[PDB]
């Protein structure tokens, strides 16, 4: 099914006749336009149109699978007004600002604007082979850089300087760090929040490296924890439990498995190994045009995995004031199982 | 006048009794909380309260000048509901999403939510001496790194690699690049949009370096253009005109000068030197907790400069397919003139 033919039944069930697409990732998903922060798409009974300004004329002509109307706001949605006369027009309420909604309300007085909240969650969950290729390229770059920087992770090095080395190499390759890099050593390993600080890595520390590459618009995501010297027996048990949990959750991936059941599998396992109050609250997420997108792997999730989806699996266990471990891989759901896309070594500790 | 005593008359003129502050920069401005993406402030007849969650308990106690209520949304604004009973409550319509507004509407059924659009524009335009100090520190870091990277800008070097060197050094210093770095050589100098590409700098090129440092939450911003080898006579005339324009606009800065009149001064000057259809459409902007904030120096601006404001002055002239020049300095308005905060050399060409 085409992307448009995936989207239209969703709009029907949501009770709207049209959709103003404003989230850059969904503008790009639908049209192929790669400067999507400066584009908008109207999906309507008349078809679908990409709105962008004249700076982008040639680019949009080359990239867009949709016809273009070339102008600046407010001419864009004013031109669109006659198309949505008398229609229920959905909009992305978790993206659109109130001021932007007011602008549309003024332009479309004979339309009914309908807020869509969770409606388009996981719209992009299943990737095409072209999209998978782009994600593989991003993850391959991530793996290359991780492999290059790994030996520099040793006693005497600041967390921050490890992060700088990773960033430098991703950028030089024509990519970028996908999100604020995490390099968490020793007690900093217990904060899932923290990013690379000036703390100096020391003998005995575990070091958690949480990183992804953005390349050609697509993201990757993985997490590794490594030992510098010999860790405490406690931290070794924690590492071994998190790795056991990760590999077990990954091994249950297949079309039809419920995301919540994956989360439960990880929870139960960590609980069996004495870490059932120390663990992260979501097992993982979709990855694509955004680092964090549908599906969601939490206990309450109603998501069901299907072939073509790309997700993370990331159990974590944190011991406040002591240390913590996260291990994460990027997984493609296949027709009868899974394929791990993130190839960097997972070491013993 | 305190920040609260600056804000309350503005709210009065805007016809509201209260304000839900959601823009991170204004949350931080008002409270001093530095993880302001995860804080919200209610300004009300009862006073002002910072809302944030328990991860931030100690930090908020240490940083906030305002009392704290500790919880996650929606408990935060539900707890706030009784405070705004029967009140007109302003909200930042250019920040708040429609979904977030719906959440507030449900929580506050006995309140009237009032959209504020341009209302708080330039709220933070005048900086305190502490804020000025933070901006000086950011700009000093920018100048240091620029001075360090400048000699590497030569024939054979990719624009991208110059950008990487700048980023590396800012990060290692405990700061960050304030915005996507621009290193624009040769014809790339004619695109004000473009960022550092893989283009190799060559003899004869001008190179425009547009950069700032974010450090401790505060931003800096400057732009330099340099010659690699000997430029064409045309590009030299363009450079000399832009520098002439920049220094002239800067020399007119004082309390009471209209931002629009500064823009006109630059326009007229470029026009006199045959570049009056080649120039940028805004002369500059405020800088602070954001790279781009009030005031605005465009022809239509109603802004009037006052002591304590920090702005950029950046004339530009672009010759499509050939090249272009931008030169920009960061300026503090003083009681009887100005002080240039950006100290990197401006070279001859
Ligand atoms: Mn990760
Ligand atoms: Mn600049």
Which CATH number is B2's domain given? 3.40.350.10
Experimental approach taken: X-ray
- How far, in Å, from the CA of A225 to the mean position of ligand 2? 39
Nearest-CA distance A102 → chain B (Å): 9
Quote the ligand 1 centre to A92 CA distance (angstroms): 27
Residue A96 has its nearest CB partner, among B98, B160, B171, at: B98
- Assess contact for B294 and B178: CB atoms under 8 A: no
CA of A157 to the centre of ligand 1 (A): 21
Q: How far is CA A54 from CA A39, A68, B143, in A?
A: 11, 10, 36
The Å distance, Cα B190 to ligand 2 centre, comes to: 15
What is the interface size between A and B, counted as CB pairs within 8 Å? 64
Interhelix angle for B129-149 vs B159-172, to 10°?
A: 130
Give the Cβ contact number of residue B28 at 10 Å: 21
Residue A280 contacts B, CB cutoff 8 Å: no
Which tokens sit at A270? 């960590």
Are B327 and B346 a contacting pair, CB within 8 Å? yes
Helical residues (DSSP H) of chain A, grouped into ranges: 3-13, 24-31, 57-63, 75-80, 98-107, 129-149, 159-172, 233-251, 259-272
Is B321 near chain A, with CB under 8 Å?
no
Strand partners, B309: B126
Do B15 and B162 lie in one domain? The reply is no
Question: How far apart are the CA of B246 and the centre of ligand 2, in A?
Answer: 13
Which of A76, A99, A124 is the last residue before a domain boundary?
A124
Pairing of strands B39-44, B18-21: antiparallel
Tell me which of B124, B141, B175 is where a domain ends.
B124
* DSSP H or E segment with residue B164: helix B159-172
Bridge partners (DSSP) of residue A304 are A258
Q: Of B124, B156, B189, which residue is a domain's last? A: B124
Q: Does A97 touch chain B (CB under 8 A)?
A: yes
Say how far apart CA A124 and CA A277 lie, in whole Å: 33
**Same structural domain for residues A95 and A180?**
no
Q: Which chain B residue has the Cα nearest residue A191?
A: B55
The CA angle A279-A283-A288, to the nearest 5 degrees, is 145
Q: How far out from the chain centre does Cα A12 lie?
A: 27
Half-sphere exposure of B45 (CA within 13 A, CB side): 11
Best probe of the B interface among A98, A152, A162, by most B CBs < 10 A, is A98
What is the Å distance from ligand 2's center to B149 Cα?
16
In whole angstroms, give the CA distance from residue B250 to residue B263: 11
How many domains in chain B? 2
Maximum pairwise Cα distance, chain A: 70
Structure tokens given for A123: 């719209």
A190 contacts A214 by C-beta, under 8 angstroms: no
Residue-wise DSSP of B186-230: GGGGG-SS----SPBP-TT-EEEEEE-EEETTEE--EEEEEESS-
For residue A329, the SS3 value is strand
Q: What are phi and psi of A185, to 5 degrees?
A: -110, 145
What phi and psi values does residue A78 have, to the nearest 5 degrees? -65, -45
Cβ <8 Å between A97 and B99:
no
**C-alpha span between B267 and B279 (Å, rounded):** 7
A285-286 β-sheet, strand order = A293-296, A285-286, A310-313, A329-334, A337-340
Q: What are phi and psi of A77, to 5 degrees?
A: -75, -20
Classify residue A7 as left (phi > 0), alpha (psi -120 to 50) or beta.
alpha
**Using CB atoms, which residue from A117, A163, A198 is nearest to B99?**
A117
Distance CA B326, CA B295 (A): 20
- Cα B29 to ligand 2 centre (Å): 23
What's the rounded Cα separation, in Å, for the pair A198 and A201? 9
Which residues does chain A have within 8 Å of residue B172's beta carbon, measured at their own beta carbons?
160-161, 164
Q: Count the alpha carbons within 13 Å of B228 in the hemisphere toward its beta carbon.
A: 23
Q: What angle do CA B135, B136, B142 make, to 5 degrees?
A: 90
Question: Are B153 and B77 in a shared domain?
Answer: no
Query: Do A235 and A323 lie in a common domain?
Result: yes
Q: How close is the nearest chain B Cα to the Cα of A347, in Å?
A: 28
DSSP state of B156: T
Q: Give, to the nearest 10 degrees, the angle between helix A3-13 and helix A24-31.
A: 130
d(CA A244, CA A221): 19
Backbone phi, then psi, for B340, in 5-degree steps? -80, 120
Q: Which helix or strand (DSSP H or E) is residue B132 part of?
A: helix B129-149
Q: Is residue B274 classed as helix, strand or coil in its secondary structure? A: coil
CA distance B77 to B74: 6
Residue A174 shares a structural domain with residue A314: yes
CB contact under 8 A, B167 and A172: no
* CATH code assigned at B305: 3.90.230.10
Beta bridge partners of B44: B47
Extract the tokens encoding A160. Answer: 């921050």
Q: Which of A99, A121, A180, A183 to mutate to test the interface with B (most CBs of B within 10 A)?
A: A99
Was A63 annotated as part of a binding site? no
Radius of gyration of chain B (CA): 22
Burial class (CB in 10 A: 0-12, 13-18, 19+), A196: buried
CB crowding A68-82: b at 16 or more within 10 Å, else e: bbbeeeeebbebbbe
Query: Is A322 in the same domain as A194?
Result: yes
Q: Looking at the structure, do residues B158 and B66 belong to the same domain, yes or no? A: no
Residues B51 and B119 in one domain: yes
Q: Strand, helix or coil at A13?
A: helix
User: Is A180 at the interface with chain B, CB within 8 A?
Assistant: no
Nearest by CB to A198, from B163, B168, B174: name it: B174
Residue pair B40/B20 in contact (Cβ under 8 Å)? The answer is: yes
DSSP 3-state of A106: helix
Residues 6+ apart with CB under 8 A from B91: A98, B19, B20, B22, B101, B104, B113, B114, B115, B116
The answer to whether B343 is annotated as binding is no
Which residues in chain A touch residue B161, judged by CB atoms under 8 angstroms apart?
A: 172
User: Does B168 contact A164 at a Cβ distance shorter than 8 Å?
Assistant: yes
d(CA B21, CA B6): 15
Q: In what order do the strands lie in the sheet with A182-185?
A: A182-185, A206-211, A222-227
The secondary structure of residue A128, as a DSSP letter, is P
Domain match, B348 and B207 both:
yes
Residue B328 burial (CB < 10 Å; 0-12/13-18/19+)? Answer: buried
Ligand 1: distance of its center to the CA of A218 in Å? 15
Q: How far is B197 from chain A (nearest CA, A)?
A: 9
Rounded to whole angstroms, how far apart are CA atoms B16 and B88?
Answer: 5
Instruction: Note whether B101 and B201 are same-domain residues.
Output: no
**Three-point CA angle A149, A150, A154, nearest 5°:** 110
Q: Identify from B53, B90, B99, B145 which residue to disrupt to test chain A contact, counting A C-beta atoms within 10 A and taking the largest count.
A: B99
| A195 annotated among ligand-binding-site residues | no
Residue-number span of the structural domain to which B273 is assigned: 125-349
- In angstroms, the CA B325 to CA A177 distance is 30
User: Is A221 a known ligand-binding residue?
Assistant: yes
What tokens were used for B199? 């283009």
How far CA A193 is from CA of A69, A189, A245, B129, in Å, comes to 43, 9, 21, 32
Q: What is the DSSP string of B69-100?
A: EE--TTHHHHHHGGGGTT-EEEEETTTSBHHH
Do A197 and A275 belong to one domain?
Answer: yes
Show the tokens assigned to A199.
């703390």
A210 is in an annotated binding site: yes
Q: Are A167 and A177 in contact (CB under 8 A)?
A: yes
**Residue B167 to residue A171, Cβ atoms within 8 A:** yes
In A284-322, DSSP assigns E strands to 285-286, 293-296, 310-313, 316-319
Give the chain B residue whose CA is nearest to the CA of A159: B172
Peptide bond into A103 cis (omega under 30): no
Q: A267 and A166 in one domain?
A: yes
Question: Out of A55, A98, A172, whose CB is closest to B164?
Answer: A172
* A5 in a known ligand binding site: no
- The data reach a resolution, in angstroms, of 1.8
Cβ separation B174–A95 shorter than 8 A: no
**If we measure between CA atoms, which residue out of A57, A2, A53, A52 comes closest to residue A27?**
A52
């Amino acid at each position: 099914s085409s992307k448009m033919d995936q989207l239209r039944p969703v709009l029907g069930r949501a009770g709207v006749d049209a959709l103003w697409v404003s989230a850059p990732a969904n503008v790009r998903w639908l049209s192929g336009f790669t400067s999507a922060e400066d584009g908008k798409v109207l999906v309507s009974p008349d078809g679908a149109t990409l709105y962008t300004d004249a700076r982008y004329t040639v680019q949009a002509q080359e990239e867009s699978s949709l016809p273009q109307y070339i102008a600046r706001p407010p001419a864009t949605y004013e031109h669109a007004a006659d198309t949505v006369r008398g229609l229920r027009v959905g909009f992305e309420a978790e993206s659109l600002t109130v001021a932007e909604l007011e602008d549309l309300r003024q332009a479309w007085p004979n339309s009914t604007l309908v807020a869509l909240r969770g409606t388009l969650g996981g719209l992009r969950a299943v990737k095409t082979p072209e999209e998978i290729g782009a994600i593989r390229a991003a993850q391959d770059l991530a793996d290359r850089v991780y492999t290059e920087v790994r030996p520099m992770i040793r006693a005497g090095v600041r967390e921050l300087d490890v992060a700088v080395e990773i960033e430098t190499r991703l950028r030089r390759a024509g990519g970028e760090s996908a999100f604020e890099l995490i390099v968490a050593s020793g007690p900093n390993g217990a904060k899932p929040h923290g990013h690379a600080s000036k703390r100096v890595i020391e003998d005995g520390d575990l070091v958690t490296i949480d990183m992804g590459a953005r390349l050609g618009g697509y993201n990757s995501d993985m997490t590794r924890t490594v030992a510098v010297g010999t860790p405490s027996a406690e931290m070794k048990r924690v590492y071994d439990a998190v790795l056991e949990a990760e590999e077990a959750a990954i091994a249950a991936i297949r079309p039809g498995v419920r995301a919540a059941d994956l989360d439960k599998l990880a929870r139960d396992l960590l609980t069996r190994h004495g870490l059932g109050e120390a663990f992260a609250h979501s097992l993982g997420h979709g990855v694509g045009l955004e680092v964090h997108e549908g599906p969601g792997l939490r206990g309450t999730s109603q998501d069901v995995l299907e072939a073509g989806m790309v997700i993370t699996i990331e159990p974590g266990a944190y011991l406040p004031g002591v240390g913590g471990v996260r291990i994460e891989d990027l997984i493609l759901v296949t027709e009868d199982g899974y394929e791990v896309l993130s190839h960097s070594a997972k070491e013993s500790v």
